[PDB]
Amino acid sequence: QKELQEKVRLGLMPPPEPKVRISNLMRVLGTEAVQDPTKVEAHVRAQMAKRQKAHEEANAARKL
Amino acid sequence: DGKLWNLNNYRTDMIQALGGVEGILEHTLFKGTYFPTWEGLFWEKASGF
Amino acid sequence: NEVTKERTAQCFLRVDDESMQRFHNRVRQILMASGSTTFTKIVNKWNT
Amino acid sequence: VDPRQTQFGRNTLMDMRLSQQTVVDPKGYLTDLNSMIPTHGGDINDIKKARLLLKSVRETNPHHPPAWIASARLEEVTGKLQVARNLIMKGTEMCPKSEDVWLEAARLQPGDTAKAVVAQAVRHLPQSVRIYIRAAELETDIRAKKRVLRKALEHVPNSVRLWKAAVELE
Amino acid sequence: NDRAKVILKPDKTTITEPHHIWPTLTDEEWIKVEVQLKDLILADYGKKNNVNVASLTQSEIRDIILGMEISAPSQQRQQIATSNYETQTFSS
Amino acid sequence: PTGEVLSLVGKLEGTRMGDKAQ
Amino acid sequence: RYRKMKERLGLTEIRKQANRMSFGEIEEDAYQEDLGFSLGHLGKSGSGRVRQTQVNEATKARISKTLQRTL
Amino acid sequence: VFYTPKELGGLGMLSMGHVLIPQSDLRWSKQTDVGITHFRSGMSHEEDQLIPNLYRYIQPWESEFIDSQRVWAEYALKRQEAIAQNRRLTLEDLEDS
Amino acid sequence: TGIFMHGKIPTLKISLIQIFRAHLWQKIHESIVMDLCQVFDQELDALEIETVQKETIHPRKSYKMNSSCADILLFASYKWNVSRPSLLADSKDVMDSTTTQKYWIDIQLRWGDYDSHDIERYARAKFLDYTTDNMSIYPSPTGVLIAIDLAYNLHSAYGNWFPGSKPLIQQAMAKIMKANPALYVLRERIRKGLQLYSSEPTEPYLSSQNYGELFSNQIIWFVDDTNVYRVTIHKTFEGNLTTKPINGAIFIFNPRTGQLFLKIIHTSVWAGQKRLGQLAKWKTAEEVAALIRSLPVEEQPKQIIVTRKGMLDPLEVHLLDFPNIVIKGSELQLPFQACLK
Amino acid sequence: EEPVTADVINPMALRQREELREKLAAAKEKRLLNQKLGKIPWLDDTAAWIERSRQLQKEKDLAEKRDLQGLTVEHAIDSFREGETMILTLKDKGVLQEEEDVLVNVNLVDKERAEKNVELRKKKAQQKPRSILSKPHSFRLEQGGT
RNA sequence: AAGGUAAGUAUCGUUCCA
């Protein structure tokens, strides 16, 4: 965690975007989600799919 | 055994002797607030801050 | 006198020195415990 | 107070909606039972506004018996039972076809006056009414109970409850 | 109603059976139609209140969509904000 | 006139406890 | 965590209704053992909601983790 | 300022002293649209007003005890009859007690 | 400010410094001046008033109580038969004292005590003590001093009047007392210093800020009642506008499932009902309570939002048997009246 | 000076008098209803009871063989168009408030609010500006149109 | 006799004094 935070403070990777779910959809992005709700839910579902894909292909890479 | 005393008559007579709502509110800053009448008011015993 | 229903005695009532001293001490400890208490709190304690 | 206890020891509503390619899903209109005296009560704050509401409505919707019934419940809860009696006796002529109103009037009227109400309800509802048994145990004498059952046996004697009450009568 | 309908039928087909109500579109056409409806709502607000839509930031865009809009009828009640406390002049 | 409280000793000639409280 | 802190220390409607103390409305002194404890508009005919102010659940008393461990 | 009840801004302080109120504290003026008008409280020329003392607002123990005996006798007579008449009591009967 | 302290009451000193901040004093004096300047501008021809002048004076004249000076001055188009010095409630001045061109008015403010809250005596006393003065500068012997008591919201005026001036001052002051931005903000500050409010009870209002917490796992009912009583009105091109009542529809929308319960409101229910607004108010409440009693307990709504504030009241009576159901009003002009279109 | 005569108001006295008046009204109503409702052989005959039951059973055998409106519309006549139909809803009014009914259209009302806001931003018979706050434009509607 | 000093930033005058 400290190594990651130091790297982000350097800026080698972007600052971690807040992990958001369906329950957090209107808590985090709701004000920006009123104008284009379907785009915002598509973006949060894309983030969910990216997290799940990272997990699944991490398992696949670790697969024997 | 319930409360063994009553103060409704005592407060009634205190208001009567003090001059009533206007006889007491004349001493206060009520007229400065300029409410049309003293009904429909509540005291905020605690400020939110 | 319940057997005869006649006024036969007379009970003079009084508040003893202990109760007066206790009430005075209560008022004293109300007053001394007023470093920051509101006027309403002091008067509520007094009425009680 | 419990007569065995000594010093040392709600808003009814007739309507009812049934659930269940067509978007239109109409539902049947169901009428409900009557409401008796509930153990739960007094869940009201700021009475001086609620009484005003019920007052306004008892002329705004004078043909809604549960308005009068809720007024009775509210005024009986807050220590004004006599005015509740008066208001129920006033409103019973506005919805005289409702069993619940007459039942509330019977339960909110003491002594012989209660009889005067229950002997009057049958005048408006003489066909297959539970009010007959309310008269039956509202009075005192078994002979009067027999007469009440016979009157029930004289006006719509098709009630199994009426027959059961009258059969086991001397 | 009318321009809203025209936006709601971007395709000439615009299939709508009596089983459902709104036109049958998939996700991306929903994106496009929602963007169009947002633009329509901001355009109507700008026409009504004579303010360019771009200046309306996202917060007041949400306020407009939901039903928030404020006015300033008590504009002279700003007193809470060589001393200029009698310099103000009277104009007939 | 003054706000100081006067002892009602000797002020009880014509008053009772239950009077003016029914 | 901050949301739960704001919920625990937030003004429950029954609490906020008790702070309001009406005006020019004498009330019988409740709680004989200690007067100056008036509920104000809570249960008062002056103003407030027609329905009774329902009790909240976030303010329910709770025991500590170590004390529950002792239990 | 002291003996005014709590919701009227005062402290609602109870008293048992002979507290006189000067007749300069019972006068109030209101400005109607036509013009200012003034009022007193003792509008007939009478004695000086006096704060009511708690002494006159608490029933003596003697009266309370004799009334307790009488009232409980009334309640007993009003309950044993209710047994025979078969009804529960009510606020209407016991309001007088 | 002009408030006088008969003793150092530090809490009162702090309170009055807080109340009269932002130079409310000088600002309140100027606000009283200019809007009182305005009323004479409208009725200047009707009173032979050539011009009205608000001369630039010392900014601290508002609370300079020792001396005084004129601030509003009327230059007359022709000579006026000025009346004697008299109070604002007087009606006996036969208006024959003298003749003048210049006519000043002085406005002085006061925060009166309890004993000394006689505003008219204040006004006359310092009219006499400012005209019979060697330090006060009044351009003409004629004039009237107007006294304002803020602590008791009293107003009086004593001095010289020209024909029609006194009733005009009466009406203008009656209006200025009931409405003035400076006096209104002073009243608001006094109210928030005592924390004494009129009505404005606290309820959870659906608004743009707490709009997020709506999206929760608890089912909510949006009771919309705008479309209950409605008449199709249309003004034909040539014929007179004509109306025809039509049916209404209650909205019991549920964001969780979308099931918009809708009770069609026949025109026959309004069989010449005099008070139709209240009938429409409790007809929706009847159906919403019926529907609540209809749904099973797990499907019973735990929160009912309402579009129009009038509907907040009836539900609480028809929801009197459901104390656990929170009925929240909405400040949000939430578009459900158009759902019927 | 001389203080004029006027009663003193006492919230306890007012409340107690109101309650006592209500109790007297209830007493009068109960006394009236006692008169209203107080004006109302075969009692214990079982054989005659059976006979009456038999005759009741046999009796069935013997009997076997909207233009009208006076509402007001809070709008101007000019606010309506021609050659088109408009829907007219009802304005929000409290149940306790006994003001007259007001029918308005939400779209025209919103347009009026928008133009009022525009005009009030554009500004940035005795004392009228402050009288309009201390003190709308509608028409009586009768016989289906004025 | 009190328990009643708001703390400040400015130019200007004066005066002793270094």
HEC per residue, J57-114: HHHHHHCCCCCCCCCEECCCHHHCCECCCEEEEECCCCCCCCCCCEEECHHHHHHHHH
Closest CA relative to residue E39, chosen from E59, E21, E14, E56: E56
* Residue D25 CB partners (closer than 8 Å, separation 6+): none
Q: For residue J134, how many other CB atoms are within 10 A of its CB?
A: 9
φ, ψ at B21 (rounded to 5°): -60, -45
- Residues in A closer than 8 angstroms to E30, CB to CB, are 38
- Nearest-angstrom CA–CA distance, D15 and I77: 79
Give me the residue from H24, H34, H36 closest to I120, CB to CB. Answer: H36
Q: How far is J9 from chain B (nearest CA, A)?
A: 6
Q: Return the half-sphere exposure (C-beta side, CA atoms, 13 A cut-off) of residue D73.
A: 27
Residue D168, SS3 per DSSP: coil
Q: Give me Rg for the CA atoms of chain B.
A: 15
Q: Strand pairing of J102-104 and J72-73? A: parallel
- I322: CB partners within 8 A, 6+ apart: I292, I300
Locate all alpha helices (DSSP H) within chain H, ordered by sequence.
Answer: 61-85, 91-94
**C-alpha angle with apex H77: H73 to H78, nearest 5 degrees?**
115
DSSP letter assigned to residue I176:
H
Place of tokens 């005959």: J45
Q: Does E69 touch chain J (CB under 8 A)?
A: yes
Q: Check if the beta carbon of residue H66 is closer than 8 Å to that of residue I149.
A: no
- Which residue is listed with tokens 């019934």? D69
Structure tokens at J141: 């509607």
Residue G37 distance to chain I (closest CA, Å) = 19
Residue I54's domain spans which residues? 1-197
Cα separations (Å) of A58 from A53, A54, A64?
A: 8, 6, 12
CB within 8 Å of chain I, chain J residues 64-93? 66-69, 71, 73, 77, 80-90, 92-93
Pairing of strands B41-43, I196-198: antiparallel
CA distance D141 to I225: 55
Write the DSSP symbol of residue I134: S
Looking at residue E26, its amino acid is: T
Amino acid at J105: N
Which residues share a beta bridge with J10? Answer: none
Question: Which single residue is written with the structure tokens 């996202």?
Answer: E58
Which of B27, B33, B34 shows the shortest C-beta gap to I194?
Answer: B33
Using CA atoms, how far apart are residues I252 and I224, in angstroms rounded to an integer?
A: 7
Which technique was the structure solved with, according to the deposited record?
A: cryo-EM
In A1-64, which ranges are continuous DSSP H helix? 2-10, 25-28, 30-33, 37-62
Nearest residue of D to residue G48, measured between CA atoms:
D46
Q: How far apart are CA G61 and CA G65, in angstroms?
A: 13
Residue type, E27: D
CA distances from I269 to I245, I287, I317 (A): 12, 14, 22
CB-based contact I34:E63 (threshold 8 Å) = no
Question: Number of helices and strands (H, E) in chain G?
Answer: 3, 0
Q: Exposure of A36 by Cβ count < 10 A (0-12 exposed, 13-18 middle, 19+ buried)? A: middle
Q: For residue I9, which nucleotide's C1' is closest to its Cα?
A: K4
DSSP, collapsed to helix, strand or coil, labels residue I233 as strand
What is the per-residue burial (b if ≥16 Cβ within 10 Å, else e) of J101-122?
bbbbbbebeeebebeebeeeee
Can you spell out the DSSP letters for A46-60?
HHHHHHHHHHHHHHH
The beta-carbon neighbor of G50 closest among I196, I202, I317 is: I317
Contact H39, H27 (CB under 8 A): yes
DSSP I1-43: -----SS--HHHHHHHHHHT-TTHHHHHHHHHHHHHHHHHHHT
The torsion defined by the Cα of I172, I174, I175 and I180, in degrees rounded to 10, comes to 100
Q: Which residue of C has its CA nearest to G32?
A: C48
Tokens 């009812």 belong to residue: D16
Q: Report the CATH number at residue I72.
A: 3.90.1570.40
Beta partners for residue H31, in sequence order: H36
Give nearest nucleotide to I8 (CA–C1').
K4
Phi, psi of J103 (to 5 degrees): -105, 125
Q: Does the CB of I312 have a partner CB in chain G at under 8 Å?
A: no
CA distance B31 to I150: 9
Instruction: Give CA–CA dist I245/I235, Å, rounded.
Output: 15
Buried b / exposed e over D46-75, threshold 16 CB at 10 Å, is bbebbbebbebbbebbeebbbbbbbbbbbb
Q: Which residue of F has its CA nearest to H62?
A: F18
Beta strands in chain D, from DSSP E residues, in sequence order: none
Asked if I167 contacts I9 with a C-beta cutoff of 8 angstroms, the reply is no
The resolution, in angstroms to one decimal, equals: 3.7
Q: Is D17 helix (H, G, I), strand (E, B) or coil?
A: strand
Q: How many CB atoms lie within 10 A of CB C9?
A: 5
> At F19, is the secondary structure helix, strand, or coil?
coil
CA distance linking residue F8 with residue B12, whole number of Å: 21
Dist CA B24 CA B40 (whole Å): 18
- The neighbouring-strand residues paired with I196 are B43
Q: Indicate the residue type of B27.
A: H
Checking chain F for breaks where C and the next N are over 2.5 Å apart, the residues before them are none
User: Whats the size of chain G, residue-wise?
Assistant: 71
